[PDB]
């Protein structure tokens, strides 16, 4: 009980049922599209400036001179000096993504003060290098008792005959709690980087965040030290009711909030949340007030935000 | 397969040939069709027939051709294929055994096929995302459909789903006629009776029945075929391995 | 995993063991029943017809629960036997207490209460058998009910359980006339649907058993049709099919 | 693994499996109940059946006694068991004390039954919710609602099942003393509240009415058709 | 350098074939002819730099500057991994070269000679939006709330950036639209791109991962770099679950590269300054909590299935263009309590139109809609619940 | 590691703790807050009723109930456990009156309820888990007005002023700050209502609270709407 | 039961090209390498000439395609799907006849059992009495044998001896004779070999019987 359309059938379907201006409408629409495409084609590329400096700043003399003789050099980090064999140092180089070679370098002052393990410029054909290339509860009370007291008067430990150690693990608001404890050594969540950090540190409580490049970093760090690790002996977790109320007040101070807000009630309604979650609740209350089109956010808006973000008759 | 043939012909031919009909109707054109069913029902054969009788550029992806070892290569290949189809539009992309490239996704862990999953996600985006496809119809084929990701089964990515049930003994008689047309039959032969003797047999099973009847004829250096040979071929091809303890069989009254 | 016991609720609120039993009923031998103003009838296929089995019992799926009531079982053999004996006991207990045959709805309610108790209490697997009851009573004449493993029962004009139940019920819906069906027409329809649902060559008279309950002279009679009558009915049905084919030709 | 045990507590302090029983209740056809000045009414969705299926064997409204009726939403077998036990205990209480059961008493007994079945580990909770509507022996249109967790409350009008939330909100908005002033406005409100879920209004609606010192009466389909016609006329007129 | 927007012609209000629409289209075409004629006419109307070019290498290459040194020397990457200690000519702007810039080098000597600021990876350029989908907010039925939140997150912070300032509240710079398979997640992005004045940027998580070495992280760098150079911008990442699934210890190298690219993305999500980000996702649980951490993905918009009212609105929206028959009644299809997405409703309408065409009638009907609903949906036991 | 030591009420954890009992104590919190106060003039109970939706007539949320004519029980926790323990308390009070022809002391009745709650998994009584409910019995006896708090672990203790429920921690400090040994019943009522207003979601107004008092004199009394409004006028 | 030997037969009686591969060879550690190898095998066989691909041991890859809820099993499923698609897909092959052997035909996928891809499904049952006699004749050929031997007894004695173990019977009887310093094996020598090959397991906890 199913049929197949015929040529006359489909022709009738096309023509019979249509407003008189269908063909003209389709023609004009196709014209619109084709002309838009033509305009796009005829756009004409806007000349991409090459970054040329303003005239009268070019010299062309130093340019010709450097082109004639500047001897471009490739970059590579030295790996070893093979003990320098006293004379004939025979350094080893690790030209990146290209190869590793050995070199005498020459033209520099002293085979040792040239370089040990850092970037260098190898010459193109003869790999002789030329230039040394330049580069809140007990969770805070315990950390206080172990840092701040041995910050202003650590000599008490030696006075009492105890060695004041270093190295504390902040395992668990870790970041801002550590920043308040500092209230600085910022770290990013490799071996060259940690070596650089060693140089900065040793010319002066190092806040490691998230804690064989990385293996070499660990080896050098352990050798140097024998510090604040931030894995995620003092522990960090969620706050209790009073901590949540304090965080709510801290984050709601900077808002056009109503006169009285039951932050205790909000902390009670918001269990097992984090500082970021609390920030989100406050911000959502703000957008709820804005949606309501009222300059002053109210407890109702804050409760709505709590319900929306954080989240029956058998318990009353 | 008259109904399935005409439905698939609708989905592919009608939009590519006469979009004015859909414009007048005020309905967006169908985009994709998924052929699912038991083996040997005619999915790939219908795909071949469409490819042979269609004047639109017929692209074919077969099996896990898009599963390339190199990271982020299946998605690139899928994108290039859809670009090529757009270039040679109107295009019909047959895609056999999609469950290979694309099934119910898994929780990405150490034991998850993240690369294949993301290639399937790229296919989803190409089928239905921004800049919807203009004249690129898709004919995907699968054997088990329930495991296909619901994202693929989403109408709009698969605007139609054609089942291919095994023949109803009438399709069986027709398939026997089709595959025995080039067969030196003998009078007093009832392909109808052969069809009834074949219950619930797939089209592939019917073709195998014809092949085995021809083999039996060849056995006696013959050119004949008769009811005896056809019946024996049916018995040989549909060798059902049953259970014979009778206790495991009679557990269920 | 919310399915290790019959007394466990999935987070969606589903009894997975009960659902497994309901689905597994699909393996049972096909049975079906039709109601007619003249009487009611059941048909049932024999799953296994091996030639080395006797016919010691003149019925394998259809049992007589009391004077005015019969039932067909479809499911695990052990549970079917247990529930058949228990149904006989329930009906005869009602007869002893009240001195009148138990109404079919009441008998169904009792057995379904027991089935539900099994689905609900402790470490007992649900009774994995569906049942089709036919009966006569002074309150609603002839009745046909269908009971599931989960202790749920419904009154049906005509229905089918077991193998190919979907196809059988589809045919019954298509062909069953609501209120102008006689016993002969019901038998013809039953044979037709059984032929189109078994899908095992021709519907042999030995691979099927039919029973009919009808009121006669104020006393109910349940007759299990003999092989001769089954042969006659199948022969008539195939004659009608041949006539239809010839006319269509 | 804090689940799959009726007698195991979770960190929040939940009984997750009785909660799951409530969720199972949530998957049942809607049933509304309302109380009037002298009339208490229960409406229920039908969901319709295949023509081959008889209707008298499907029940969502059942009279627990002369002066008490029960509407249901949940598992049908559990419904049958609970209703049977409730009737048994109604008659047993009539025997023990020569006064007809009060709606509060019978609903408390049903709640106690559900609680008993959910206390132990070798039992599955009755995954049902029930509405008991009746007239106390002094005369009062009392309506209580009982949950699988053995908890029962008293309402003036509530809906349970699939459309529980939407129908409850509609009743919340459009329940008033003037809306229940007489014994026809309550019925009109019931059909109005059920029409947001049911389709035909007359082919997918069953109403039971209890009048003071009068037995339960199930409204005829023709009467339901007349009522829905009245509501449609009122709506168009107000338009 | 300001936003880029997306060229789009005005919208003809009448959807019916009428003279209002015809005259509107005629005027549009008139103005297009005017543009073409103006162009044609204008481009018909119309030593020291030569030696600058001569000194500059003939096939000069493009590399990346690194760790500028001195006032005349710098380290530059050749764009093949290697790097060189090159010199700088006086030609370049100077006081303008910064690390990461795409400088121009003399081919042989490899000496910095240009800056080529507009260097954009062809991938980034192509994924940038030029056209604009013609799906305005009017085409979205229901999802009124979701529209409100998306506007508050990506529209209000641009049209009225005084409300947030008045109460000292930072705008949410990340919105993840999570939901079942098809509910309008991509429609909302389409509408935002259409109606917004900000530079839109389509991307799919399965696109940012390239094979050669660190090109994945480099491409993420380029994408967010251009999203910063242009402002305001909206970066729409569809099916982010391609990259962002639960981070796990890698047992191979490709997985390590994928995790590296995802980490690079998270890193670039700490470069505030006004570049809004709209993630889309079918399954949100698989996403790493780090991504869904409430400091990089501020809002999570759930796209639930449509209710009765929403389904009704969707049906009118998608049948407005269809010559509906008077006999139809659009309530029975909707309130039948079965899963129905907006995509499912569009499929229902399309299949109904096709059924009517098959029946040879151009007007859909109730039976056509019923058959369409039966034949479109593909996929609890009876009696167990009443 | 806390996944094998809390599968049963009769399993000891390495810290020697009954984790299931602790879990029930945690479950106590979900209920609405209740405050009881003892004074030389009697005892006052005030509970934050938590109507989930209006149209629920208030005479079904029984957070305060009567035990004999001289004690009142304030509940916080599962309604089922509440009902069971309230029935036990009433039956025990009536049994003691029947036997000894007197009125059971508040301490004795609380002890009896605790004795019922003791049976966790003893195969000799049939509950198998802690009763997730905390009760406050405020009554009058020969020893003057008294108030006792009983928790699911079967522990009961005298309390001159206590608060339980969701707002337990937040209300305990308020009680500590505002409590001086000598008050009057009106003063205790005012302080309790002030604390409830402090730690209630809704605005304290007529409904949404219940207030009860037991005095050396008139029996246990439930303040009606009139008296509730009168007190709320000048809380 | 001598199916790999029948494949070795073809290859010494086939004029067409032969490509023997191991069902476990197709599997690879890198993603997509297995499907690539299957495609390469089939394309090479198609292009070269009339070819016979003997994928011995097919059950290493083809097993029933269950959900597989993981990575490696999905890669195996993709290998199987590529094999199916190459054997009978859109681009039909010609003269690429395929032979595959497995020890367990039940576990194989139902799609790679479809007339059109596997239209023979030959079984190789354990030798019957007659096949035992034929095998014994074929093996005891090229072998000096005693006049007092009765191979009929060994053939008739009902056991489950396969072709490989019949070969082992003859082989170890030969080595026993060699150690016994004799090139003509006696009935005692066979009886010993027959016992040592039947290897009748005993000590079966007797309550089972
Ligand atoms: N005790 C506290 N005092 C002040 N602010 C707090 C406190 N606890 C949390 N916060 C708030 O939490 C945020 C600081 O937390 P931070 O960014 O360190 O996250 P975190 O909890 O350590 O999370 P993660 O390490 O998992 O990223 C700020 O909003 C800060 O106001
Ligand atoms: N309807 C039919 N008419 C004629 N031949 C048919 C039909 N269906 C199947 N066949 C035969 O079956 C062969 C295989 O068909 P096809 O490969 O398309 O099946 P399929 O359903 O895709 O199976 P598979 O599960 O193996 O992919 C066809 O070459 C043809 O010989
Ligand atoms: N609310 C809606 N209003 C109008 N059309 C809708 C709506 N929701 C879905 N659609 C239809 O579905 C398609 C839009 O769905 P969209 O692509 O946004 O879904 P999605 O969430 O990205 O899906 P997926 O997870 O499958 O990728 C279009 O066909 C549109 O017609
Ligand atoms: N029919 C036979 N005739 C003669 N020798 C046989 C026969 N079958 C097996 N053998 C002997 O057994 C050896 C092993 O046979 P073959 O490897 O072909 O068996 P198979 O069934 O393929 O084994 P597998 O399952 O271990 O791969 C053959 O080399 C030959 O020594």
From Swiss-Prot, chain B:
Task: Give the UniProt keywords, A-Z.
Answer: Acetylation, ATP-binding, Cytoplasm, Nucleotide-binding, Nucleus, Phosphoprotein, Proteasome
State where ATP binds: 37-44
Q: Where is this region: May mediate interaction with PRPF9?
A: 33-253
Query: What are its GO cellular component terms?
Result: blood microparticle; cytoplasm; cytoplasmic vesicle; cytosol; cytosolic proteasome complex; extracellular exosome; inclusion body; membrane
Any keyword Aminoacyl-tRNA synthetase? Answer: no
Q: Which GO terms describe its molecular function?
A: ATP binding; ATP hydrolysis activity; DNA-binding transcription factor binding; general transcription initiation factor binding; proteasome-activating activity; TBP-class protein binding; thyrotropin-releasing hormone receptor binding; transcription factor binding
Q: What does this protein do?
A: Component of the 26S proteasome, a multiprotein complex involved in the ATP-dependent degradation of ubiquitinated proteins. This complex plays a key role in the maintenance of protein homeostasis by removing misfolded or damaged proteins, which could impair cellular functions, and by removing proteins whose functions are no longer required. Therefore, the proteasome participates in numerous cellular processes, including cell cycle progression, apoptosis, or DNA damage repair.
Name the record gives this protein = 26S proteasome regulatory subunit 8
Q: Which residues of the full protein are shown?
A: 154 to 406 of 406
UniProtKB/Swiss-Prot annotation, chain C:
Q: Any idea what job this protein has?
A: Component of the 20S core proteasome complex involved in the proteolytic degradation of most intracellular proteins. This complex plays numerous essential roles within the cell by associating with different regulatory particles. Associated with two 19S regulatory particles, forms the 26S proteasome and thus participates in the ATP-dependent degradation of ubiquitinated proteins.
Subunit-structure text: The 26S proteasome consists of a 20S proteasome core and two 19S regulatory subunits. The 20S proteasome core is a barrel-shaped complex made of 28 subunits that are arranged in four stacked rings. The two outer rings are each formed by seven alpha subunits, and the two inner rings are formed by seven beta subunits. The proteolytic activity is exerted by three beta-subunits PSMB5, PSMB6 and PSMB7.
* CDD domains (UniProt xref): proteasome_alpha_type_4
Enumerate the Gene3D superfamilies for this protein.
Glutamine Phosphoribosylpyrophosphate, subunit 1, domain 1
Alphabetical GO biological process terms: proteasome-mediated ubiquitin-dependent protein catabolic process
The reply to whether Cytoplasm figures as a keyword in the UniProt entry is yes
Question: What is the predominant subcellular site recorded for this chain?
Answer: cytoplasm
Q: What is this protein called?
A: Proteasome subunit alpha type-4
Which keywords are on file for this protein? Acetylation, Cytoplasm, Host-virus interaction, Nucleus, Phosphoprotein, Proteasome
Sites where N6-acetyllysine occurs are at 124, 173
Q: Which cysteines are joined by disulfide bonds?
A: none
What is the top-level taxon of the source organism? Eukaryota
Family statement drawn from the similarity comment of this UniProt entry: Belongs to the peptidase T1A family.
Curated annotation (Swiss-Prot), chain D:
Q: How does it assemble?
A: The 26S proteasome consists of a 20S proteasome core and two 19S regulatory subunits. The 20S proteasome core is a barrel-shaped complex made of 28 subunits that are arranged in four stacked rings. The two outer rings are each formed by seven alpha subunits, and the two inner rings are formed by seven beta subunits. The proteolytic activity is exerted by three beta-subunits PSMB5, PSMB6 and PSMB7. PSMA7 interacts directly with the PSMG1-PSMG2 heterodimer which promotes 20S proteasome assembly. Interacts with HIF1A. Interacts with RAB7A. Interacts with PRKN. Interacts with ABL1 and ABL2. (Microbial infection) Interacts with HIV-1 TAT protein.
Post-translationally, this protein is described as follows, namely: Phosphorylation by ABL1 or ABL2 leads to an inhibition of proteasomal activity and cell cycle transition blocks.
Name listed for the protein in its UniProt record? Proteasome subunit alpha type-7
What is the stated purpose of this protein?
Component of the 20S core proteasome complex involved in the proteolytic degradation of most intracellular proteins. This complex plays numerous essential roles within the cell by associating with different regulatory particles. Associated with two 19S regulatory particles, forms the 26S proteasome and thus participates in the ATP-dependent degradation of ubiquitinated proteins.
The family annotation for this protein states:
Belongs to the peptidase T1A family.
Gene assigned in the entry: PSMA7
Q: Name one GO molecular function term.
A: identical protein binding
Q: Which residues are reported to carry the modification N6-acetyllysine?
A: 226
Q: Where in the sequence is Phosphotyrosine found?
A: 152
Keyword Glycoprotein listed? The answer is yes
Swiss-Prot record, chain G:
Record's keyword annotation contains Manganese: no
What's one GO MF term for it? ATP binding
Claim: Phosphoprotein is one of the keywords in the record:
yes
Modification N6-acetyllysine occurs at: 188, 192
GO CC, alphabetical: ciliary basal body; cytosol; membrane; nucleoplasm; nucleus; proteasome accessory complex; proteasome complex; proteasome regulatory particle, base subcomplex
Keywords in alphabetical order = Acetylation, ATP-binding, Cytoplasm, Nucleotide-binding, Nucleus, Phosphoprotein, Proteasome
Q: Which compartments does it reside in?
A: Cytoplasm; Nucleus
**Subunit organization:** Component of the 19S proteasome regulatory particle complex. The 26S proteasome consists of a 20S core particle (CP) and two 19S regulatory subunits (RP). The regulatory particle is made of a lid composed of 9 subunits, a base containing 6 ATPases including PSMC4 and few additional components. Interacts with NR1I3. Interacts with PAAF1. Interacts with TRIM5. Interacts with ZFAND1.
Instruction: Outline what the protein does.
Output: Component of the 26S proteasome, a multiprotein complex involved in the ATP-dependent degradation of ubiquitinated proteins. This complex plays a key role in the maintenance of protein homeostasis by removing misfolded or damaged proteins, which could impair cellular functions, and by removing proteins whose functions are no longer required. Therefore, the proteasome participates in numerous cellular processes, including cell cycle progression, apoptosis, or DNA damage repair.
Under what name is this protein listed?
A: 26S proteasome regulatory subunit 6B
Name the species this protein comes from: Homo sapiens
Its gene? PSMC4
């Amino acid at each position: 009980p199913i049929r197949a359309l015929d040529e006359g059938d489909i022709a009738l379907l096309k023509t019979y049922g249509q407003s008189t201006y269908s063909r003209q409408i389709k023609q004009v629409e196709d014209d619109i599209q084709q002309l838009l495409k033509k305009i796009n084609e005829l756009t004409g590329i806007k000349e991409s400036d090459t970054g040329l400096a303003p005239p009268a700043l070019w010299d062309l003399a130093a340019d010709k001179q450097t082109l004639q003789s500047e001897q471009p050099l490739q970059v590579a980090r030295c790996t070893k000096i093979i003990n320098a064999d006293s004379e004939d140092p025979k350094y080893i180089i690790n030209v990146k993504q290209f190869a590793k070679f050995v070199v005498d370098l020459s033209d520099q002052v002293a085979p040792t003060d040239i370089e040990e393990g850092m970037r260098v410029g190898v010459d193109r054909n003869k790999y002789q290098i030329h230039i040394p290339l330049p580069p809140c509860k007990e969770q805070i009370e315990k950390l206080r008792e172990v840092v701040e007291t041995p910050l202003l008067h650590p000599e008490r430990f030696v006075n009492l005959g105890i060695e004041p150690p270093k190295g504390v693990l902040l395992f668990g608001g870790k970041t801002l709690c550590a920043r308040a404890v500092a209230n600085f050594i910022r770290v990013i969540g490799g071996a060259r980087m940690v070596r650089e950090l060693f140089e900065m540190a040793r010319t002066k409580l190092i806040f490691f965040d998230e804690i064989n490049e990385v293996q070499r970093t660990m080896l050098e760090l352990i050798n140097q030290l024998d510090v604040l690790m931030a894995t995620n002996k003092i522990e960090f977790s969620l706050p209790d009711l009073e901590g949540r109320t304090h965080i709510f007040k801290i984050h709601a101070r900077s808002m056009s909030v109503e006169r009285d807000i039951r932050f205790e009630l909000l902390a009670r309604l918001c269990p097992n949340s984090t500082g970021a979650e609390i920030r989100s609740v406050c911000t959502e209350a703000g957008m709820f007030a804005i949606r309501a089109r009222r300059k002053i956010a109210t407890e109702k808006d804050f409760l709505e935000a709590v319900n929306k973000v954080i989240k029956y008759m058998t318990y009353n | 397969l008259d109904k399935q043939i005409k439905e698939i012909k609708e989905v592919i031919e009608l939009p590519v040939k006469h979009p004015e009909l859909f414009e007048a109707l005020g309905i967006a054109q169908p985009k994709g069709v998924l052929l699912y069913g038991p083996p040997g029902t005619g999915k790939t054969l219908l795909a071949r027939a469409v490819a042979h009788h269609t004047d639109c550029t017929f692209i074919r992806v077969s099996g896990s051709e898009l599963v390339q070892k190199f990271i982020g290569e299946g998605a690139r290949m899928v994108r290039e294929l859809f670009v090529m189809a757009r270039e040679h539009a109107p295009s019909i992309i047959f895609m056999d055994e999609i469950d290979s490239i694309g099934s119910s996704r898994l929780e990405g862990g150490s034991g998850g096929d993240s690369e294949v999953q993301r290639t399937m996600l790229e296919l989803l985006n190409q089928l239905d995302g921004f800049e919807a496809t203009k004249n690129i119809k898709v004919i995907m084929a699968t054997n088990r459909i329930d495991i296909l990701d619901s994202a693929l089964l989403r109408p709009g990515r698969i605007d139609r789903k054609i089942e291919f049930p095994p023949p109803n003994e009438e399709a069986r008689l027709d398939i026997l006629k089709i595959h025995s047309r080039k067969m030196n039959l003998t009078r007093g032969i009832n392909l109808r009776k052969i069809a009834e003797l074949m219950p619930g047999a797939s089209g592939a099973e019917v073709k195998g029945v014809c092949t085995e009847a021809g083999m039996y004829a060849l056995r006696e250096r013959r050119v004949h075929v008769t009811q005896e040979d056809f019946e024996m071929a049916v018995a040989k091809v549909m060798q059902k391995d049953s259970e014979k303890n009778m206790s495991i069989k009679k557990l269920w009254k | 995993r919310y399915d290790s016991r019959t007394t466990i609720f999935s987070p969606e609120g589903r009894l997975y063991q009960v659902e497994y039993a309901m689905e597994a009923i699909g393996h049972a031998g096909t049975c079906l029943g039709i109601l007619a103003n003249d009487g009611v009838l059941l048909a049932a296929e024999r799953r296994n017809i091996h030639k080395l089995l006797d016919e010691v019992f003149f019925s394998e799926k259809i049992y007589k629960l009391n004077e005015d009531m019969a039932c067909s079982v479809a499911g695990i053999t052990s549970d079917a036997n247990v529930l058949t004996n228990e149904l006989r006991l329930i009906a005869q207990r009602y007869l002893l207490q009240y001195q009148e045959p138990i109404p079919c709805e009441q008998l169904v309610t009792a057995l379904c209460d027991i089935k539900q108790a099994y689905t609900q209490f402790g470490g007992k697997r649900p009774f994995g058998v569906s049942l089709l009851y036919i009966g006569w009573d002074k309150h609603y004449g002839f009745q046909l009910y269908q009971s599931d493993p989960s202790g749920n029962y419904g009154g049906w004009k005509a229905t089918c359980i077991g193998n190919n139940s979907a196809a059988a019920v589809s045919m019954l819906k298509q062909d069953y006339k609501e209120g102008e069906m006689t016993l002969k027409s019901a038998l013809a329809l039953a044979i037709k649907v059984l032929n189109k649902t078994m899908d095992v060559s021709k519907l042999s008279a030995e691979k099927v058993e039919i029973a009919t309950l009808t009121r006669e002279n104020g006393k109910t009679v349940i007759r299990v049709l003999k092989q001769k009558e089954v042969e006659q009915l199948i022969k008539k049905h195939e004659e009608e099919e041949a006539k239809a084919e010839r006319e269509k030709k | 693994s804090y689940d799959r045990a009726i007698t195991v507590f979770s960190p929040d302090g939940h009984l997750f499996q009785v909660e799951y029983a409530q969720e199972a209740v949530k998957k049942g056809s809607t049933a509304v109940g309302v109380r009037g000045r002298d009339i208490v009414v229960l409406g229920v969705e039908k969901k319709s059946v295949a023509k081959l299926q008889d209707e008298r064997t499907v029940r969502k409204i059942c009279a627990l006694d002369d002066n008490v009726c029960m509407a249901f939403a949940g598992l049908t077998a559990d419904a049958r068991i609970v209703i049977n036990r409730a009737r048994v205990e109604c008659q047993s209480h009539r025997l023990t004390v020569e006064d007809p059961v009060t709606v509060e008493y019978i609903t408390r007994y049903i709640a106690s039954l559900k609680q008993r079945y959910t206390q132990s580990n070798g039992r599955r909770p009755f995954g049902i919710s029930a509405l008991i509507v009746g007239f106390d022996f002094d005369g009062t249109p009392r309506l209580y609602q009982t949950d699988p967790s053995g908890t029962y409350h008293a309402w003036k009008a509530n809906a349970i099942g699939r459309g529980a939330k939407s129908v409850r909100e509609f009743l919340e908005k459009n329940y008033t003393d003037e809306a229940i002033e007489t014994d026809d406005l309550t019925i009109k409100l019931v059909i109005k509240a059920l029409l947001e879920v049911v389709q035909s209004g007359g082919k997918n609606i069953e109403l039971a009415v209890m009048r003071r010192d009068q037995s339960l009466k199930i409204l005829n389909p023709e009467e339901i058709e007349k009522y829905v016609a009245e509501i449609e006329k009122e709506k168009e007129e107000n338009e | 350098k300001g936003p880029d927007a997306a060229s789009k012609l005005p919208l003809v209000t009448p959807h019916t074939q009428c003279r209002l629409k015809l005259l509107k289209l005629e005027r549009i075409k008139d103005y297009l002819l005017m543009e073409e004629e103006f162009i044609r006419n204008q481009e018909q109307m119309k030593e020291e730099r030569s030696k600058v070019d001569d000194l500059r290498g003939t096939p000069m290459s493009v590399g990346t500057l690194e760790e500028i040194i001195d006032d005349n020397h710098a380290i530059v990457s050749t764009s093949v991994g290697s790097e060189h200690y090159v010199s700088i000519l006086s030609f370049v702007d100077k006081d303008l070269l910064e690390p990461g810039c795409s400088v121009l080098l003399n081919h042989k000597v490899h000496a910095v000679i240009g800056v080529l600021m507009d260097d954009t990876d062809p991938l980034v350029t192509v994924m940038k939006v030029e056209k604009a989908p013609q799906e305005t907010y009017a085409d979205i039925g229901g999802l009124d709330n979701q529209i409100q939140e998306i506007k508050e997150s990506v529209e209000l912070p641009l049209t009225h950036p005084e409300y947030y300032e008045e109460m000292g509240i930072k705008p949410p710079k990340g919105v993840i639209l999570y939901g079942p398979p098809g509910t309008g997640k991509t429609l909302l992005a389409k509408a935002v791109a259409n109606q917004t004045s900000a530079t839109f940027l389509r991307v799919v998580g399965s696109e940012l991962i390239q094979k050669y070495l660190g090109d994945g992280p480099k491409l993420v760098r380029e994408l967010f770099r251009v999203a910063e150079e242009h402002a305001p911008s909206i970066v729409f990442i569809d099916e982010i679950d391609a990259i962002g699934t639960k981070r796990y210890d890698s047992n191979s190298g490709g997985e390590r590269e994928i995790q590296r690219t995802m980490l690079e993305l998270l890193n670039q999500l700490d470069g505030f300054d006004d570049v809004k980000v709209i993630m889309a996702t079918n399954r949100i649980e698989t996403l790493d909590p780090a991504l869904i951490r409430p400091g990089r993905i501020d809002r999570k918009i759930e796209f639930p299935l449509p209710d009765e009212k929403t389904k009704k609105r969707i049906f009118q929206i998608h049948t407005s263009r269809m010559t509906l028959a008077d006999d139809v009644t659009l309530d029975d299809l909707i309130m039948a309590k079965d899963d129905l997405s907006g995509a499912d409703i569009k499929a229902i309408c399309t299949e109904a139109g096709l059924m009517a065409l098959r029946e040879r009638r151009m007007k859909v009907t109730n039976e056509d809609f019923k058959k369409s609903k039966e034949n479109v949906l593909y996929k609890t036991p009876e009696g167990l619940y009443l | 590691t806390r996944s094998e030591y809390d599968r049963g009420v009769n399993t000891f954890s390495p810290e020697g703790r009954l984790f299931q009992v602790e879990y029930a104590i945690e479950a106590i919190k979900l209920g609405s807050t209740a405050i009881g106060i003892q004074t030389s003039e009697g005892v006052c109970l005030a509970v934050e009723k938590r109507i989930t939706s209006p149209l629920m007539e208030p005479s079904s949320i029984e957070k305060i109930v009567e035990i004999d004519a001289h004690i009142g029980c304030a509940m916080s926790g599962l309604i089922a456990d509440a009902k069971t323990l309230i029935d036990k308390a009433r039956v025990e009070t009536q049994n003691h009156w029947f036997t000894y022809n007197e009125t059971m002391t508040v301490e004795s009745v609380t002890q009896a309820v605790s004795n019922l709650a003791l049976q966790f998994g003893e195969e000799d009584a049939a509950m198998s888990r802690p009763f997730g409910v905390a009760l406050l019995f405020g009554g009058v006896d020969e020893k003057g007005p008294q108030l006792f708090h009983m928790d699911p672990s079967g522990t009961f203790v005298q309390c001159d002023a206590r608060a339980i429920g969701s707002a337990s921690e937040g209300a305990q400090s308020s009680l500590q700050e505002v409590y001086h040994k000598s008050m009057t019943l009106k003063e205790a009522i005012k302080s309790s209502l002030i604390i409830l207003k402090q730690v209630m979601e809704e605005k304290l107004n007529a409904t949404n609270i219940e207030l009860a008092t037991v005095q050396p004199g008139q029996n246990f009394h439930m303040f009606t709407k009139e008296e509730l409004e009168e007190v709320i006028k000048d809380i | 039961c001598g199916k790999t030997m029948l494949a070795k037969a073809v290859a010494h009686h086939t004029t067409a090209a032969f490509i023997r591969v191991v069902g476990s060879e197709f599997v690879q550690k890198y993603l997509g390498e297995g499907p690539r190898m299957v495609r390469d095998v089939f394309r090479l066989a198609k292009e070269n000439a009339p070819a016979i691909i003997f994928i011995d041991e097919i059950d290493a890859i083809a097993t029933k395609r269950f959900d597989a809820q993981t990575g490696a099993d999905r890669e195996v499923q993709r290998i199987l799907l590529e094999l199916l698609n190459q054997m009978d897909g859109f681009d039909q092959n010609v003269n690429v006849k395929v032979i595959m052997a497995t020890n367990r035909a039940d576990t194989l996928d139902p799609a790679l059992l479809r007339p059109g891809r596997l239209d023979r499904k030959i079984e190789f049952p354990l030798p019957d009495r007659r096949q035992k006699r034929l095998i014994f004749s074929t093996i005891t050929s090229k072998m000096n044998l005693s006049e007092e031997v009765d191979l009929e007894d060994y053939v008739a004695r009902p056991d489950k001896i396969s072709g490989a173990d019949i070969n082992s019977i003859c082989q170890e009887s030969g080595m026993l004779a060699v150690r016994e310093n004799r090139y003509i094996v006696l009935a005692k020598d066979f009886e010993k070999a027959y016992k040592t090959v039947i290897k009748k397991d005993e000590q079966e906890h007797e309550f089972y019987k």
